[PDB]
Amino acid sequence: YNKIVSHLLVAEPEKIYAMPDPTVPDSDIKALTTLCDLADRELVVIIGWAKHIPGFSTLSLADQMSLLQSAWMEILILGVVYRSLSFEDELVYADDYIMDEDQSKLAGLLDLNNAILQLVKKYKSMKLEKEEFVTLKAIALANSDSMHIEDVEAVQKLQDVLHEALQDYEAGQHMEDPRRAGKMLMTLPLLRQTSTKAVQHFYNIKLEGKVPMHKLFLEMLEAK
Amino acid sequence: YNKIVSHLLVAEPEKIYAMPDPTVPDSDIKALTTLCDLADRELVVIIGWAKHIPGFSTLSLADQMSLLQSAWMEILILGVVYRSLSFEDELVYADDYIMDEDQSKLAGLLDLNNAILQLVKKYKSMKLEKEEFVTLKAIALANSDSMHIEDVEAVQKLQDVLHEALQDYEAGQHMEDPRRAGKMLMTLPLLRQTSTKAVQHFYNIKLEGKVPMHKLFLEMLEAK
Numbered sequence: 128y129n130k131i132v133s134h135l136l137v138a139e140p141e142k143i144y145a146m147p148d149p150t151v152p153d154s155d156i157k158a159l160t161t162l163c164d165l166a167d168r169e170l171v172v173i174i175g176w177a178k179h180i181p182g183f184s185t186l187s188l189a190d191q192m193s194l195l196q197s198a199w200m201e202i203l204i205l206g207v208v209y210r211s212l213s214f215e216d217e218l219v220y221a222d223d224y225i226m227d228e229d230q231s232k233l234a235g236l237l238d239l240n241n242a243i244l245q246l247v248k249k250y251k252s253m254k255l256e257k258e259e260f261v262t263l264k265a266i267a268l269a270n271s272d273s274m275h276i277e278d279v280e281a282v283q284k285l286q287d288v289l290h291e292a293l294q295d296y297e298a299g300q301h302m303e304d305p306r307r308a309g310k311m312l313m314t315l316p317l318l319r320q321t322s323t324k325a326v327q328h329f330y331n332i333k334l335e336g337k338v339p340m341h342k343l344f345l346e347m348l349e350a351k
Numbered sequence: 352y353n354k355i356v357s358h359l360l361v362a363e364p365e366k367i368y369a370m371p372d373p374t375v376p377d378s379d380i381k382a383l384t385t386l387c388d389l390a391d392r393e394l395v396v397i398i399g400w401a402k403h404i405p406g407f408s409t410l411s412l413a414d415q416m417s418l419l420q421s422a423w424m425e426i427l428i429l430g431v432v433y434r435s436l437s438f439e440d441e442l443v444y445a446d447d448y449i450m451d452e453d454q455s456k457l458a459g460l461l462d463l464n465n466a467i468l469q470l471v472k473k474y475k476s477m478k479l480e481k482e483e484f485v486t487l488k489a490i491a492l493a494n495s496d497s498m499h500i501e502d503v504e505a506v507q508k509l510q511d512v513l514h515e516a517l518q519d520y521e522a523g524q525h526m527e528d529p530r531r532a533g534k535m536l537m538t539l540p541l542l543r544q545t546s547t548k549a550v551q552h553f554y555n556i557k558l559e560g561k562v563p564m565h566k567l568f569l570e571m572l573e574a575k
């Protein structure tokens with residue numbers, strides 16, 4: 128099929144482990160600390176992954192940073208959503224960190240994780256493919272609506288290249304549904320809605336100062 | 352062109368007036384009271400308008416209400432965005448209520464109105480047409496991601512009918528850009544993001560109890 132899709136598939140990063148501290152008693156602080164630690168390490172991986180998206184590394188460093196600072200939460204959330212598609216009412220943050228409803232309650236994340244579960248449910252019904260997941264991640268980066276872009280036409284070209292990839296993929300692989308590309312694009316509002324609420328929630332956790340957070344996660348949170 | 356588009360055009364409601372009280376001194380309370388009063392009357396008009404969307408009135412009354420309760424803020428915001436396309440740095444809430452940056456500051460809405468202005472700016476660059484505006488309003492209603500839908504397949508059919516209308520319209524009217532329909536769909540995340548923040552902001556105004564609000568606006572706010 129489409130070459131951009133095949134390229135994004137081979138550029139997909141390896142999974143990483145959450146490694147919750149086995150000496151620490153389970154608590155809301157432990158869960159939130161584990162999750163923000165995992166996110167910090169995933170952000171390093173996301174920055175490296177974006178260099179593989181066609182045209183991304185030719186943007187100015189400022190525009191690269193603006194896109195990543197706008198899109199990082201959507202990219203992280205799309206990841207856990209995809210990892211969770213074969214599960215029922217559980218979120219696979221990592222192979223060693225799967226959250227059920229009780230754990231979400233304990234961490235203070237019941238409402239936020241339930242919105243992520245709504246995303247999972249919709250993609251399950253659509254039978255979201257890995258090809259579509261990696262293309263949507265890249266589209267979410269290009270379409271992230273930063274207010275600080277220098278070269279707007281170059282970012283629009285990036286959007287166009289990835290959108291065309293999705294169009295072409297669906298036209299060749301899903302002829303039974305001539306609206307599947309658009310259906311995939313119409314899942315992005317709920318992703319943006321959930322990411323908006325997640326950023327607000329974890330910014331409040333940052334302000335409360337009870338959960339330690341690493342440098343990169345704080346930089347992305349403070350920018351966003 | 353497409354019949355659904357032509358139908359939505361003739362079903363477009365007439366504009367209504369804000370009618371700020373000329374005896375009341377200008378204040379943040381006056382501005383917010385005027386705006387929520389306008390929104391309350393527009394919500395009545397939106398409920399009547401939705402009956403014209405093909406298939407909408409055949410949904411259960413519960414599903415009709417669920418869609419409207421999820422989508423109402425996006426529909427209102429898309430309206431002011433469209434009315435503002437011929438203006439510069441001003442938001443045309445009504446012909447008699449146009450907000451510039453200073454008035455937004457006075458009302459406590461500078462950040463929220465600036466996000467609405469970001470939507471305006473993007474649609475200006477895309478040269479958003481009335482045909483596209485009315486189709487996107489209907490798509491926003493069908494795609495509003497309510498958690499309480501009874502007949503999910505019927506709501507998906509509604510999404511499909513309106514999405515096909517946009518597809519067909521762009522294929523016939525905008526052959527120069529084979530990705531214009533998708534570009535239009537990719538403006539919906541920023542609309543959802545801005546509406547999410549607006550709902551939070553006006554719910555806080557509701558809780559502070561200093562701005563009087565009418566019955567329907569309160570019902571939509573409390574549901575959403």
Ligand SMILES: CCC(C)(c1ccc(O)cc1)c1ccc(O)cc1
Nearest residue numbers: 162163166203204207239240325329
């Ligand atoms: C703030 C990001 C964070 C910790 C996260 C971490 C790793 C990951 O792969 C996806 C998301 C998160 C966001 C929302 C939420 O409900 C729970 C956790």
Ligand SMILES: CCC(C)(c1ccc(O)cc1)c1ccc(O)cc1
Nearest residue numbers: 386387390427428431463464549553
């Ligand atoms: C809460 C709805 C409200 C009052 C509104 C009213 C009429 C209308 O056509 C569109 C929106 C609004 C929302 C966000 C905002 O920044 C300013 C005002």
